[PDB]
């Protein structure tokens, strides 16, 4: 779709692998924010998204947390705490026909800025200056959308660049989007390095005598410390007691 009418794709209840995309050697830019390009197949997320739009080469840098300009303030804005990975690559082979492809638009004029993760497909006449346009197009009244004009015979900064923006999100809710991790056996009564759905650490996983509510999965203590969790596979309550330590 266009930049001002990007399509948001919700991903949930599945296992997502990301190593096959980073090692594909086809994506030009694979910048990750908040996370790393590696060590992501061992984490589980709760709700991720996947945006898709086509911009030009000189505007790929504007799709980043903190960057500002024209395509990052009126069409698609990313938050400053965006925890995801921006994926873009050159596509000057099917999105640029002879003569000029005018199927991609970008919002050029807008009254105010754009809040992060917001879509606006309005096509009202931008009222510039002081004379009310009242719907007509003329002096001080410009159209909000403008065509790109993708021609195959252009520079590196005027070619189509399909951008995919993955918006990861990790919460305390039951995570669904996991990674390719081999589930091991639950070992108890010993201080071992456990690896849950995103709550890592070392401790003695024992049996607890508390009552977890059907909607509750994790647990915490009076000092904001996780002392009990719920098994992903089974429905048992495993109390996380700290490992043995002290002074000498």
């Amino acid at each position: 779709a266009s930049v001002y009418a990007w399509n948001r794709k919700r991903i949930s209840n599945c296992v997502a692998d990301y190593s096959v995309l980073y090692n594909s050697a086809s994506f030009s830019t694979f910048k990750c924010y908040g996370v790393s390009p590696t060590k992501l197949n061992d984490l589980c997320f709760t709700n991720v998204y996947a945006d898709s739009f086509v911009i030009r080469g000189d505007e790929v840098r504007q799709i980043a947390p903190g960057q500002t300009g024209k395509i990052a303030d009126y069409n698609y804005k990313l938050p400053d705490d965006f925890t995801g990975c921006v994926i873009a690559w050159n596509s000057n082979n099917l999105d640029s026909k002879v003569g000029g492809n005018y199927n991609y638009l970008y919002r050029l004029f807008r009254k105010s800025n754009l809040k992060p993760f917001e879509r606006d497909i309005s096509t009202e006449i931008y009222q510039a200056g002081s004379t009310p346009c009242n719907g007509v197009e003329g002096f001080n009244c410009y159209f909000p959308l403008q065509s790109y004009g993708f021609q195959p015979t252009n520079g590196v900064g005027y070619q189509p660049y399909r951008v995919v923006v993955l918006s990861f999100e990790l919460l305390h809710a039951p995570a669904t989007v996991c990674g390719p991790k081999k589930s091991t056996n639950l070992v108890k009564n010993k201080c071992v390095n456990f690896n849950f759905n995103g709550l890592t650490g070392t401790g003695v996983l024992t049996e607890s005598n508390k009552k977890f509510l059907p909607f509750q999965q994790f647990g915490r203590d009076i000092a904001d410390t996780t002392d009990a969790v719920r098994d992903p596979q089974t429905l048992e309550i495993l109390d996380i007691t700290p490992c043995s330590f002290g002074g000498v």
Partner: antibody
Amino acid sequence: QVQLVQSGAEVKRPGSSVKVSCKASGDTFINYAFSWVRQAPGQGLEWMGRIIPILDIAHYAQKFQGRLTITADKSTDTAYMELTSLKSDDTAVYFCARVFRGSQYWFDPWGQGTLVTVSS
Amino acid sequence: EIVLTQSPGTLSLSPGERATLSCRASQSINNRHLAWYQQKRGQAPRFLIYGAASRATGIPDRFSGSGSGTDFTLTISRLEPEDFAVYYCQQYGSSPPTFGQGTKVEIKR
């Protein structure tokens, strides 16, 4: 500068469809919309519809929703107007107009007109 | 708003005298959205004035129009022999564009 060349007269048969073109020139085809207005003999003008090339949106009139299909090729700069299920009282001079890309517009640039006679 | 009726209809006037063409609307046009045209014999209409107040590109100052809410008037001062055609009205303040009837100015002999 801006010349909207149209086609010629079309001697069509009753109960059929026609296709009149409008060769646009002068400026860019995407920065200006196009509307077609017919003129019955001695009966004023009549706005049929309008298309937006940049948005590919074509909103017709209440009396043409279903029989009027206006297209526009953004490669050859030509606006097409097709009318299906033509009646006998359709011997109007169809004019081409290069309207703006707003909700309200005026038919400043005109063409030459095509006297398409349906009843033959 | 969707209705335009020409009051004169016909006007037998001599070249040189002022002309007055009216266009009555059913409802009121909010932002004086009215346009005037000039269609000669076997030709396309010519855009004359936008907004009923100012000429568009090169129309001389002889063609002038007044601004009102429900009834506009066109003043063709110093009428020339070449300015003998049919003039139409067009209200672009509503969603469906509507036209008028047409006033033909002929030579008075």
